[PDB]
Structures are given as structure tokens and as C-alpha cells.
Design a protein around this ligand. Structure first.
Ligand code: HEM
Ligand SMILES: CC(C)C1=CCC2=C(CC[C@H]3C(C)(C)CCC[C@]23C)C1
Length: 466
């Protein structure tokens, strides 16, 4: 087996992991190497912490390591048996992946939804404008959370709401926060198989309530769309994912049930919410703490957009520094520092070590992104490192893997980048920013809180001015 720290009886290595396990794993792998055995109680795991080992796992043996480890929380409303996120690579997963690649996240579909997202960006602009008149600090975590939910809801459901914090949006927010509280804590049933039948912390029960809330809303949206399409055959076709769902269902070309689609929408909606929310916050935090970089991005946006307030997504090719800024946030602050787990579908040898069937595989993208043997000055925020650099986060550069790579690489990347780039551009272009209070500024920026997505323990509070 790969080398690693001595595992104690019963608990394995679990007692050493602390509040930020990805940081502990990063330091451990400096000692034990880029393939490292960790015993999460009885859940045997191997940590991957090199670009070289990530390529061996995700690409050379990408089919063997194509499975997922499935947390007990994921069994809520039998999501584990329906979900593109957790099914094994097989016909049903392949069909759902094809639907996302060729129809939902196509260039054609992303361009068609650009206007839906533009109005949500305008709503964000207006909201921040009021705080700026008042002189009030903006809580960037909450602003990014609402904006991301609004942008996701627009793209997936064409949600209407003229208010920034609409009641539909705030119900989504309640649900997403609830899922994060549940999953964001250790479920001992995940680590001790004798406890699974018992659900001793009620994690799966509590997850059922939130998953059910979300599926109920999605099923309602789907049924409403089906009825309005039936009643209004001549109305223009909407440019959202729900329209695509409906057409695919009624064309009946896929061996997929209705719940595959509702659960896919669930997966996509939750998929883009904490991830973009924390990333937007980190982007603003890095820029506020590195005023030279804030100035350089402002200068680019001024040059390209000038007096326009809302950048078109179509303009992204003209904004290389904005792209470099987001790459650099992804390098330092991958929202999931250990990505989503993979699983060995069979015994496999890697670098002379046996990786047994069923091993949980965690890619420590965070460690790789901060490894000094790979990145110069790894702890410094330096977007310029990506200018005229062909390294990207699409999965082909194993130094930068915030979205994974190989078989299960994030299918929502096309939408995520549009959200990240535009939310950042809107905030940076239209206001200057100061910390509400800079007395513990460095500590506020460094302090991470682990969870579904790793985020600043202290929410960023900054005052907008013009
Ligand atoms: C915003 C930043 C985002 C990051 C950093 C991110 C990252 C990731 C990562 C690391 C994975 C696992 C990849 C692997 O197994 O190799 C993943 C999977 C996934 N992501 Fe994302 N993601 C983001 C946004 C989104 C968005 C916007 C959506 C939906 C629109 C989404 C939907 C998914 C889904 C459904 C999967 C599961 C795919 C599968 O297992 O086949 N993500 N993401
Ligand atoms: C984008 C990446 C990080 C992501 C992680 C968690 C989520 C993904 C999409 C779907 C979603 C559920 C199926 C609702 C289960 C909890 C986490 C997970 C799998 C996608």
C-alpha cells in the first residue's frame, strides 16, 4: 500500500485531521509522498498530491478510478442511485453527461442565456449602488451567494424575480445552507460501516428534508413548464435548461426516467451554488488585499468596457487579466480542495503500490496548487503568472485541477466561468472598495473554514465607493 502516517486502532488517522484536513494532508504528503494512505476509520483512502500522480490516476488509469465514493448523506431520496454525480460510468451516466456537454453547456446554450444572466447582474449592480450611497459595507459572502443563486436560477429555470433577494431565491438559500450544515460535519456512519444502518447522527434523515424541498421546487417548475408549453404552442421557446429537459423528455430518445432529469437539475443547481459563492468572495478578497492587482484589473475593464456598466460575457476573450485573476483564485482557493472523491473500480498498481478495489481517491488540488516545487512564490496572489501562459483549468494541466480532470471532470465549467468572471467584473468595474475594518485584515484573509466549499471564516465586508 502507499506509505502514510501510522493509523491507530479504531480511528485510523482521523484524530489528526483537524478543522482543515486539506491543509493537514498537504503537510503530510511532504513527508510521505504524492500517493499517501490515510485511514478515515475503516474508510481506506489514498491522497494524490502531485501533478504526476494526478495524471496517472485521472488519465492513464482514468477508467479504473472513474467511480465515486458515496457519502451516506447522498442516499437521501435515493439520489445515490439516480445522480450523474455518483452513478458509475455506464449507460445512464453517459447519457446524462452527453446531455450536459452537447445541449445544456453548449456554446449555443450559454450564449442564448447570456441575457437572462445580464438582468441578474444588473440587479446586483443596483443593490450595491444603494449600499454605496448609504456608505454601508457590503457582506460579499451574502451578496455573492444571492447573485449566484439568481444567476443559476435564471439559467436553469428562467426565474423571473425583479427583486435581488426574492422570496424564491431566499428559499433556495435556506436549502443550500441547510445541505452545507449537514454534509459539512463528519458523519461517523461514513467511517464505521457498523453505524450505517443506524444513521446515528440523523444526517441522512436531515438531508432528506432538504433534498425533498429542492426536488419539490424543481418538479413544480418542470410541471409548470410542461403545462405552459401545452397551452401556448406558439409562444417563443425559453433559453433555459428546463426547456431542454422538456424537449428531451418528449422526444423520448434516452432511456432515462423523469427523476433522472429532476435529480440532474438538483445536481446542477447545488453544483454551482457554494462553489461560485465562495470563489467570488475569495476573488474580491484577494483583489482588496493586493491593491496593485485591483488597479490592473480595473484598468483592463476600463479599456474594454469603458462607461458600460455590465460587461458582455461575449467579451471574455478581450479580458485576459480577468481570466488570469480567476485562474489564480482557482489555483490558491479551489472551492473543493480535495475535489469530489473518486473510487478504484478494481485493484490497480500505481508507482509500485497496490491500490485496492474500493479505495477512496482524493485529489489534493489545493496542495498541488500551493506546492513550491511547482509554482514560484506559491502563497502570493500573482495573476500575471498566467498571462501568455497556456496553463488552464480545463483538466489538461495537472498543476491546476480545480474542476478535476478525466472521466468525471466538472461538466458545469462553462457556466461556472461565466458566473465567476461576470460577478467579479461587475463588482470591480463599478466601484472602488475599502475594508470596513483592516485591524485584523491579514488574519481574516488567511483563516479558512472547511466544508462543502472552503471559505473565509470571517466574511469579507467591504464598502463600495465611486
Ligand atoms: C464554480 C466552480 C466549480 C468548481 C470548482 C467545480 C468543481 C468540480 C469538481 C472538482 C468536480 C469533480 C470532478 C472530478 O471528479 O474529476 C465537479 C463535478 C461536478 N460539477 Fe462542478 N464545479 C464548479 C461549478 C459547477 C457548476 C456551475 C455546475 C453546474 C452547473 C457543476 C456541476 C457539477 C457536476 C454535476 C459534477 C459531477 C460530475 C460527474 O461526476 O460526472 N459544477 N465539479
Ligand atoms: C461542482 C462540484 C464541486 C460538486 C460537488 C458537490 C455536488 C455536486 C453536484 C451534486 C451534489 C449532490 C448530488 C446534490 C450531492 C452533494 C454534492 C453534489 C454532488 C457537484
Amino acid at each position: 500500500l502507499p506509505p502514510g502516517p501510522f493509523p491507530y486502532p479504531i480511528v485510523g488517522n482521523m484524530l489528526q485531521l483537524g478543522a482543515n484536513p486539506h491543509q493537514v494532508f498537504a503537510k503530510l504528503s511532504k513527508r510521505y509522498g504524492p500517493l499517501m494512505s490515510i485511514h478515515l476509520g475503516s474508510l481506506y483512502t489514498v491522497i494524490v498530491s502531485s501533478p504526476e500522480m494526478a495524471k496517472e490516476i485521472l488519465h492513464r488509469h482514468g477508467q479504473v478510478f472513474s467511480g465515486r465514493t458515496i457519502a451516506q448523506a447522498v442516499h437521501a431520496c435515493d439520489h445515490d442511485k439516480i445522480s450523474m454525480g455518483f452513478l458509475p460510468v455506464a449507460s445512464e451516466w453517459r447519457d446524462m453527461r452527453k446531455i450536459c456537454k452537447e445541449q445544456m453547456f453548449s456554446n449555443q446554450s450559454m450564449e442564448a442565456s447570456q441575457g437572462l444572466r445580464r438582468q441578474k447582474l444588473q440587479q446586483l449592480l443596483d443593490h450595491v449602488q444603494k449600499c454605496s450611497d448609504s456608505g454601508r459595507a457590503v457582506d460579499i459572502r451574502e451578496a455573492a451567494f444571492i447573485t449566484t443563486l439568481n444567476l443559476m436560477s435564471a439559467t436553469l429555470f428562467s426565474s423571473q424575480a425583479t427583486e435581488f433577494d426574492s422570496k424564491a431565491t431566499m428559499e433556495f438559500k435556506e436549502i443550500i445552507e441547510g445541505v452545507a450544515t449537514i454534509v459539512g460535519v463528519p458523519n461517523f456512519a461514513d467511517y464505521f460501516p457498523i453505524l450505517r444502518p443506524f444513521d446515528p447522527q440523523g444526517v441522512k434523515r436531515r438531508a432528506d428534508v432538504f433534498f425533498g424541498k429542492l426536488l419539490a421546487k424543481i418538479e413544480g417548475y418542470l410541471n409548470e413548464r410542461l403545462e405552459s408549453k401545452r397551452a401556448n404552442p406558439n409562444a417563443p421557446k425559453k433559453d433555459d435548461f428546463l426547456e431542454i429537459v422538456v424537449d428531451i423528455i418528449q422526444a423520448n430518445e434516452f432511456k432515462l426516467k423523469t427523476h433522472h432529469f429532476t435529480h440532474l437539475m438538483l445536481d446542477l443547481f447545488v453544483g454551482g451554488s457554494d462553489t461560485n459563492t465562495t470563489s467570488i468572495e475569495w476573488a474580491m478578497s484577494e483583489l482588496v488585499m493586493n491593491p496593485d492587482k485591483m488597479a490592473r484589473l480595473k484598468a483592463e475593464l476600463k479599456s474594454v468596457a469603458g462607461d458600460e456598466k455590465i460587461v458582455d460575457e461575449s467579451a471574455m476573450p478581450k479580458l485576459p487579466y480577468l481570466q488570469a485573476v480567476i485562474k489564480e483564485v482557482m489555483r490558491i482557493h479551489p472551492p473543493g480542495p480535495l475535489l469530489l472523491p473518486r473510487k478504484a473500480e478494481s485493484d490497480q498498481e500505481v508507482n509500485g503500490y497496490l491500490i485496492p478495489k474500493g479505495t477512496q481517491i482524493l485529489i489534493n488540488a489545493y496542495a498541488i496548487g500551493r506546492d513550491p516545487s511547482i509554482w514560484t512564490d506559491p502563497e502570493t496572489f500573482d495573476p500575471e503568472r498566467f498571462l501568455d501562459n497556456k496553463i488552464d483549468f480545463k483538466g489538461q494541466d495537472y498543476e491546476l485541477l480545480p474542476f478535476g480532470s478525466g472521466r468525471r471532470v466538472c461538466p458545469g465549467m462553462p457556466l461556472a466561468t461565466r458566473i465567476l468572471h461576470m460577478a467579479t467584473a461587475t463588482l470591480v468595474h463599478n466601484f472602488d472598495w475599502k475594508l470596513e475594518d483592516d485591524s485584523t485584515a491579514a488574519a481574516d484573509h488567511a483563516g479558512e473554514l472547511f466544508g462543502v466549499a472552503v471559505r473565509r471564516a470571517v466574511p469579507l465586508r467591504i464598502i463600495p465607493i465611486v
